[PDB]
Amino acid sequence: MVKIRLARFGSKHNPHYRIVVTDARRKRDGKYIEKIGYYDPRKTTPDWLKVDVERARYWLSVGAQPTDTARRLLRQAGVFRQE
Amino acid sequence: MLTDPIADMLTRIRNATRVYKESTDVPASRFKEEILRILAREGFIKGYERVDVDGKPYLRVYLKYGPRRQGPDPRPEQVIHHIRRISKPGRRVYVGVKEIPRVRRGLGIAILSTSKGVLTDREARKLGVGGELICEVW
Amino acid sequence: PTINQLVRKGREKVRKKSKVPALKGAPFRRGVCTVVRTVTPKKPNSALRKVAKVRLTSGYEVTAYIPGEGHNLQEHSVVLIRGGRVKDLPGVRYHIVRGVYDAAGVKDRKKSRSKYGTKKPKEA
Amino acid sequence: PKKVLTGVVVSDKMQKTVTVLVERQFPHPLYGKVIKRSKKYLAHDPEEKYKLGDVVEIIESRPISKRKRFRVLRLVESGRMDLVEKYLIRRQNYQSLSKRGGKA
Amino acid sequence: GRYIGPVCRLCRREGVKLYLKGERCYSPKCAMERRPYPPGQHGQKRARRPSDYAVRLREKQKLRRIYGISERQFRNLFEEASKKKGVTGSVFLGLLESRLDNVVYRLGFAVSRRQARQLVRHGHITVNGRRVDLPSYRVRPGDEIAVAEKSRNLELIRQNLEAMKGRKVGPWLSLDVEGMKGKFLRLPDREDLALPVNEQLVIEFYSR
Amino acid sequence: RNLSALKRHRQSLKRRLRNKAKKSAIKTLSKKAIQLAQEGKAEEALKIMRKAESLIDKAAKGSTLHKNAAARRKSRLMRKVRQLLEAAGAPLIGGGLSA
RNA sequence: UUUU
RNA sequence: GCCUGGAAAGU
RNA sequence: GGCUAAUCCCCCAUGUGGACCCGCCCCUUGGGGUGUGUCCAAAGGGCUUUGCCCGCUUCCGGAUGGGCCCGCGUCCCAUCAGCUAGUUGGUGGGGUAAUGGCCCACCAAGGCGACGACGGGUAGCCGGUCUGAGAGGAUGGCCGGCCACAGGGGCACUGAGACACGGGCCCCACUCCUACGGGAGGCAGCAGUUAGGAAUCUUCCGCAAUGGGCGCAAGCCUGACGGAGCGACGCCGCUUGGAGGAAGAAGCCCUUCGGGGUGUAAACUCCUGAACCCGGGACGAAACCCCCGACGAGGGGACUGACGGUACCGGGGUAAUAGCGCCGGCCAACUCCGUGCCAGCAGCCGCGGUAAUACGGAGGGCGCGAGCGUUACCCGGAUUCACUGGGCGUAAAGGGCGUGUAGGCGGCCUGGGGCGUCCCAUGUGAAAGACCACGGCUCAACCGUGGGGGAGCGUGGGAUACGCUCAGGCUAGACG
Ligand SMILES: [Mg+2]
Ligand SMILES: [Mg+2]
Ligand SMILES: [Mg+2]
Ligand SMILES: [Mg+2]
Ligand SMILES: [Mg+2]
Ligand SMILES: [Mg+2]
Ligand SMILES: [Mg+2]
Ligand SMILES: [Mg+2]
Ligand SMILES: [Mg+2]
Ligand SMILES: [Mg+2]
Ligand SMILES: [Mg+2]
Ligand SMILES: [Mg+2]
Ligand SMILES: [Mg+2]
Ligand SMILES: [Mg+2]
Ligand SMILES: [Mg+2]
Ligand SMILES: [Mg+2]
Ligand SMILES: [Mg+2]
Ligand SMILES: [Mg+2]
Ligand SMILES: [Mg+2]
Ligand SMILES: [Mg+2]
Ligand SMILES: [Mg+2]
Ligand SMILES: [Mg+2]
Ligand SMILES: [Mg+2]
Ligand SMILES: [Mg+2]
Ligand SMILES: [Mg+2]
Ligand SMILES: [Mg+2]
Ligand SMILES: [Mg+2]
Ligand SMILES: [Mg+2]
Ligand SMILES: [Mg+2]
Ligand SMILES: [Mg+2]
Ligand SMILES: [Mg+2]
Ligand SMILES: [Mg+2]
Ligand SMILES: [Mg+2]
Ligand SMILES: [Mg+2]
Ligand SMILES: [Mg+2]
Ligand SMILES: [Mg+2]
Ligand SMILES: [Mg+2]
Ligand SMILES: [Mg+2]
Ligand SMILES: [Mg+2]
Ligand SMILES: [Mg+2]
Ligand SMILES: [Mg+2]
Ligand SMILES: [Mg+2]
Ligand SMILES: [Mg+2]
Ligand SMILES: [Mg+2]
Ligand SMILES: [Mg+2]
Ligand SMILES: [Zn+2]
């Protein structure tokens, strides 16, 4: 079961994730299928959350469940909003 | 047997020029001619023409030099200084346009034979098609 | 050589021979002693230098040289090898580390101190 | 896509198979000179169709046996020993160059 | 701790003037003023023709010995310059000048570089507002370098910044003596400085 | 010690047995199916070839024979049966075969 | 014989 | 110890 | 031995469908469709119980992961030259998810090797990493990919998947219990111990965050991980104070006994004020959940931090670590005394036997600085294995000479093919790293964001000068 989750990339006391599509069984920071965003827990910059959707929507269009945190951020970018 | 004519021709030239000869024959061969053609164009030689000796076809090649210098050794400067063969039999050398060389930071030439024909480097670079290097000359 | 030949045999590389088989290649090797003989210099030198035979931890029995004015090296003391040739005494390729184990560094040494292992003298 | 090679049929003894010598050719990685070099592939010929010394196309294929992963696509040129000969002789050069020496 | 010690002496060892004490190194006492012979016993004795290397080394020191920096820091800056575009030798200087600690001196909020350096590790300075206690900080072009709205009212500062009234300042720089403000305009281009040094040797020195 | 999920082993053997069972059954039949054709008993041979078939697919259902394994078994069997059944005979009850 |  | 520049030998 | 429940096992049914044999059609290795025959399904549980949820069964497909196969590439020795019987191929068979001497019976007598087989040595491979002008050389540690191993060897069961690190069985070596019969074990998981060594850390905190397993969820587990701790082991930032201050204290040193040196250095005056104290005090954490809307979209609310009373903010506030190497030339920095081929130095050339800038000490000087030196190892310099980029008359180096096998090399002209060679397009070349720009931590080291490049390799199309091949022709090479 492929997933859409977050991967650690910052430093000590410094995080930075990648909203990435991988196969559950991989290491967290191991090899993934496709990066599809990044999240900055501390909004250190005027930009802490890009995502893209045409893509997210793709993997969602096929398996790839997302971590709850994944979804959270992943949604904040209206991956689901269809008003 | 004549291992490699081209090498041979460039040599014949390399030689005669040093003794300051006027002409200098060489066994005729289309390609050889094609080479000379450039030399002429690039202004390294007073040109050349087809001839006959013993009854076989040669290429009188009219050499070019500088003017008498002053003081010791009034021998003219060689219009053609350097001039060596690069791709010899058993060690063919091929370059793709992106690899063609800067013969003498500009002042020299390099003769490539290409699928478009024999031609100077910049010429090649122009038509954008490398091939076989034939002889750094300058 | 012709290219063809170069293609056939190529170029022999070069195995660089060591000069300090303290083995394990390690920086230093621990040993113990045997002799504490004196040695005559060669070439145009004359004197008597503090040498030592050593049964190493690497199962070796190499001869190490003792530096500095005077020593305290017993005949059953644990010394420390650090390798260093010695022009005058052919055969002695390793030095001792005056300052560890039973090396008890040189005494009353002001200048080059870290070499000869001696704690800094106080100025009361 | 499925690889394809060309070469002569240096061996025929094996039933339903053929040794196909395939000469490759290229520039030396470091010294330049284009060194020629080769390899022998055992093609699978089901109708003992092809004979000795015929150039053929060799096609990459699902396994027929250990030491046998190719089928004979088709016949390129028919008959022409020499090539075989050069091959047979080299096998001969080997002669006794070990205790006494090869032969000439 | 960059150097720290007999300074108006290095002036002597370099046989020229570097002005390490800011003031005083201006009056009849920078020693170079009568006693230009380097330190030590063998100072007055006749000099021996120097080695190409000798020179190289002396020059690098002179210049690096001015800004009072570590061979370490110094080196990394040059190595950084090497890696960049433009007449490397120059650029080096640029970086060198952008060292805030320098700038605070360039704007004379302090007598010399040393003293300047201290007014920084002590927070008396600022850039765009926020405080900064890193001499090594590299002022970009367009940053404002003032004084602590609190620390402003200091003797040392008033004293110095006051004596800066109607004083001409570097062309790549400018200031407002009024509110202790200031400003970094452009990277002083080679010509702008008058450093008693052939930096084109500092280049040579780092090769061999 | 005691890593409470030894239960898996425990379970393991319990299964091993249920499996071994199903197969042995398939084999003994399969073999049987042959001797009948082999000899010539057509209607009879078919009848068993049939059971065999079933027994197999059956096994295929659980984590036993599973897959094409089931399939092979079948073909390999329906193969020879039809074959040795060739020396006279003719589908007397055309059990599982067709023509 | 040795050594500068 | 003597001599040699100083040694080894010799005394 | 006996009793018993189930989503545990079994039989009969329904057969969308699907499996298998024979025939047929399209395709073309075992792909797709079709007809008769035969064969094969299922599980139930939950509540807001009469419809919703978790779940089961059969088939087609998506996605992710993987097996198998092939071209090319991958160290040293030829003081290793012949190797091979399941060995090479065939037919039938077994076996697997699947091809295959993978394994078997039978038939054939092959298969590989100097382009280096076979044997010996050594070794996880790669992205990369160090070095280098580049070509290269060296290396494969942290991080990421693949491989292999789990005391040594062998084996298989169960499973979608294993021949399975914390599962099983046997043989072995060793440790412990032992009523001597027979048993229990396996840190190359975290930490810790002991040994070996020149040398390598805490029996730490927590699940809060990220990720994972199971569960509807609540939640549980999680030595993965997130943090702290010990080690200047490395990199980066910072302090040991700033301004003044005699034509110049003293002490030590040198002296042409006038003086010269350490030295603006100190003492001392004034300023700032690391440490250290007091107050406040963080992001990282908003989801799962719950309520509103239908458990969707959207909205609302609540809970929850190990690091931490830490970072950071304001206040007060003390002049408060400096050491190590070298000073004959190479190599930047010189004078006195001690000592006399001694004691000793030493990277190389070399210094010391009575004036030593080379030994040891002091003064002074150079270098670098919480570091500095030493040993070891790698690239460099070294065009000193030379492809770029070397040589062989006398320096090391032409084989004692020939004949000729393989191989390398191959004159002039025309045409064909297009292997080499060159050009265009496209695919590939993961991330990290590297390089440029910008951004986040006060700077930096560190990190983030975006960009550009890239050899080689595959596919499609093109060019034909040179090389190759085929075909014709020539006579200047060669031969007669
Ligand atoms: Mg001597
Ligand atoms: Mg010394
Ligand atoms: Mg269980
Ligand atoms: Mg003599
Ligand atoms: Mg002597
Ligand atoms: Mg004497
Ligand atoms: Mg019972
Ligand atoms: Mg069931
Ligand atoms: Mg049924
Ligand atoms: Mg190994
Ligand atoms: Mg080089
Ligand atoms: Mg094992
Ligand atoms: Mg399972
Ligand atoms: Mg199974
Ligand atoms: Mg395994
Ligand atoms: Mg274990
Ligand atoms: Mg452990
Ligand atoms: Mg020990
Ligand atoms: Mg979790
Ligand atoms: Mg950790
Ligand atoms: Mg002062
Ligand atoms: Mg928050
Ligand atoms: Mg929770
Ligand atoms: Mg919501
Ligand atoms: Mg010097
Ligand atoms: Mg003396
Ligand atoms: Mg020295
Ligand atoms: Mg000394
Ligand atoms: Mg530091
Ligand atoms: Mg080299
Ligand atoms: Mg060498
Ligand atoms: Mg060469
Ligand atoms: Mg040479
Ligand atoms: Mg010789
Ligand atoms: Mg000869
Ligand atoms: Mg000879
Ligand atoms: Mg030709
Ligand atoms: Mg040829
Ligand atoms: Mg082509
Ligand atoms: Mg490409
Ligand atoms: Mg990359
Ligand atoms: Mg990047
Ligand atoms: Mg910034
Ligand atoms: Mg054509
Ligand atoms: Mg012809
Ligand atoms: Zn001064």
CATH numbers and ranges of domains, chain F: 1-99 (1.20.58.110)
Indicate the DSSP class of residue B116.
T
* Domains detected in chain A: 1-83 (3.30.1320.10)
Question: What's the order of all strands across the beta sheet hosting A34-39?
Answer: A49-50, A34-39, A17-23, A2-6, A65-66
Element (H, E) at B117: strand B117-120
DSSP 8-state code for residue D31? T
CB atoms within 10 A of CB D34: 13
For chain E, which domains are there?
1-96+194-208 (1.10.1050.10), 97-193 (3.10.290.10)
Q: Which amino acid is at C53?
A: K
- Write the CB contacts of D71 (distance below 8 Å, at least 6 apart in sequence): D43, D44, D45, D58, D59, D61, D64
Maximum distance among all Cα pairs of chain C, rounded to whole angstroms: 78
Record the resolution, in angstroms: 3.3
Q: Are the beta carbons of E90 and E190 closer than 8 angstroms?
A: yes
Q: Which of B66, B65, B36, B61 is nearest to B135 (CA)?
A: B36
CB of E182 closer than 8 Å to CB of E174: yes
Which residue, chain included where needed, has tokens 């002569």?
D8
**What is the distance between the alpha carbons of residues E193 and F1, in angstroms, rounded to a whole number?**
79
Instruction: Confirm whether residue E24 is marked as ligand binding.
Output: no
The DSSP annotation for B12-62 comes to: HHHHHHHHT-S----B--HHHHHHHHHHHHTTSEEEEEEEEETTEEEEEEE
Token pair recorded at residue B101: 């060389």
Is position E154 annotated in a ligand binding site? no
Domain limits of chain B? 3-80, 81-138
Domain B3-80, architecture per CATH: 2-Layer Sandwich (3.30)
Neighbours of ion ligand 46 (CB under 5 A): E 8, 11, 25, 30
Assigned token pair, B4: 């490699």
DSSP helix/strand/coil, F50? helix
| Residue B131 dihedral angles phi and psi, to the nearest 5° | 180, -130
What is the sign, positive or negative, of the torsion defined by CA atoms of B129, B130, B134, B138? positive
Half-sphere exposure of E142 (CA within 13 A, CB side): 0
Structure tokens at A82: 């269809």
B81's tokens: 């200084």
The nearest CA of chain C is from the CA of D31 a distance in Å of: 7
- Give chain E as a 3 state SS string: CCCCCCCCCHHHHCCCCCCCCCCCCCCCCCCCCCCCCCCCHHHCCCCCCCCHHHHHHHHHHHHHCCCCCCHHHHHHHHHHHHHCCCCHHHHHHHHHHHEHHHHHHHCCCCCCHHHHHHHHHCCCEEECCEECCCCCCECCCCCCEEECCCHHHCHHHHHHHHCCCCCCCCCCEEEECCCCEEEECCCCCHHHCCCCCCCHHHHHHCCC
What residue ranges in C25-100 does DSSP mark as E strands?
29-33, 38-39, 49-56, 63-65, 78-81, 94-95
D67 within 8 A of D58, measured Cβ to Cβ: no
Domain range D1-104, its CATH number among 3.40.640.10, 2.40.50.140, 1.20.1270.10, 2.30.40.10 = 2.40.50.140
CATH 2.40.50.140 fits C1-124, yes or no: yes
End-to-end CA distance of chain D: 45
Distance CA E151, CA E155 (A): 10
Structure tokens at C56: 């190493």
- How many angstroms away from the CA of C4 is the closest CA of chain D? 7
Q: Strand I: which positions are within 7 A of a protein CB? A: 9-12, 18-22, 29, 35-42, 58, 62-65, 68-72, 74, 76-77, 81-82, 88-91, 93-102, 108-115, 136-138, 143-146, 157-161, 164, 166-168, 184-186, 196-199, 209-213, 224-228, 236-248, 253-254, 260-265, 270-274, 283-288, 296-298, 307, 313-315, 319, 321-326, 330-335, 341-353, 360-379, 385-387, 390-392, 404-414, 419-424, 430, 435-437, 439-444, 446-450, 458-459, 462-467, 476-477
Q: Name the DSSP letter for residue B104.
A: G
| Residue C85 contacts residue C91 (beta carbons within 8 Å) | no
- Contact indicator for C92, C69 with CB cutoff of 8 Å: no
Q: Residue B10, SS3?
A: helix
For residues F76 and B123, what is the distance between their CA atoms, to the nearest angstrom?
Answer: 72
Report the 10 Å Cβ neighbour count for B123: 21
Phi, then psi, of D64 in degrees rounded to 5: -115, -25
User: B112: part of which helix (H) or strand (E)?
Assistant: strand B111-114
CA angle A57, A59, A63 (to 5 degrees): 120
Report whether A8 contacts A59 (CB < 8 A): no
CA distance B98 to B121: 11
Residue C33, φ and ψ in degrees, nearest 5: -105, 175
Q: CA–CA separation, B78 vs B12, rounded Å?
A: 15
Contacts of B100 (CB under 8 A, 6+ apart): B110, B112, B121, B124, B125, B130, B133
* Nearest partner of C22 among C80, C76, C104, judged by Cα: C80
Domain ranges of chain D: 1-104
Beta-carbon contacts of F3 under 8 Å, excluding residues fewer than 6 positions away, are: none
Q: How far apart are CA C2 and CA E83, in angstroms?
A: 41
- Asked if D9 and D56 touch (Cβ cutoff 8 Å), the reply is yes
Report in angstroms the alpha-carbon separations of C3 from B85, D32, F43: 16, 8, 81
**Tally of CA atoms within 13 A in the half-sphere of B16 that contains its CB:** 19
User: Could you give the C-alpha distances from B128 to B72, B103, B121, E151, F80, in angstroms and in order?
Assistant: 47, 17, 10, 68, 69
Residue A35 CA and nucleotide I286 C1' are separated, in Å, by: 23
First to last CA, chain F: 64
User: In sequence order, which residues have a C-beta less than 8 Å from that of residue E194 and are 6 or more positions away?
Assistant: none
Q: Is E136 annotated as a binding residue?
A: no
* Rounded Cα–Cα distance for residues F49 and A11 (Å): 69
Say which DSSP state B105 is in.
Answer: G
| Block residue for tokens 């040797």 | E201
Q: Which amino acid makes up residue C28?
A: F
Q: What is the DSSP letter of D2?
A: -
Angle at A41 between CA A35 and CA A46, to 5 degrees: 90
Cα–Cα distance for residue pair E35/E26, rounded to 1 Å? 15
Matching residue, tokens 């570089």: E113
Please give the residue of chain B at the shortest CA–CA distance from C4. B90
Q: Taking a C-beta distance cutoff of 8 angstroms, is the pair F60, F66 a contact? A: yes
| Token code pair at residue C98 | 């005056």
Gap between the Cα atoms of F22 and F16, Å rounded = 10
Q: What is the third-level CATH fold of B81-138? A: Dna Ligase; domain 1 (3.30.1490)
How much is the CA Rg of chain E, to the nearest whole Å?
Answer: 18
Q: Which nucleotide is nearest to F81 (CA to C1')?
A: I21
- Strand blocks (E) in chain A: 2-6, 17-23, 34-39, 49-50, 65-66
Q: Across chain D, where does the E strand assignment appear?
A: 4-11, 17-21, 24-28, 32-37, 40-44, 56-65, 68-75
Q: How was this entry determined? A: X-ray
Scored b (16 or more CB within 10 A) or e, E102-131 reads: bbbbbbbbbbbbbbbbebbeeebbbbeeee
Is-contact E20 E7, C-beta < 8 A?
A: yes
Strand E130-131 to D32-37 pairing: unpaired
On the 0-12 / 13-18 / 19+ scale of CB atoms within 10 A, A8 is: exposed
- The encoded tokens of residue A14 equal 């410094």
Q: Rounded distance, CA F28 to CA E176, Å?
A: 106
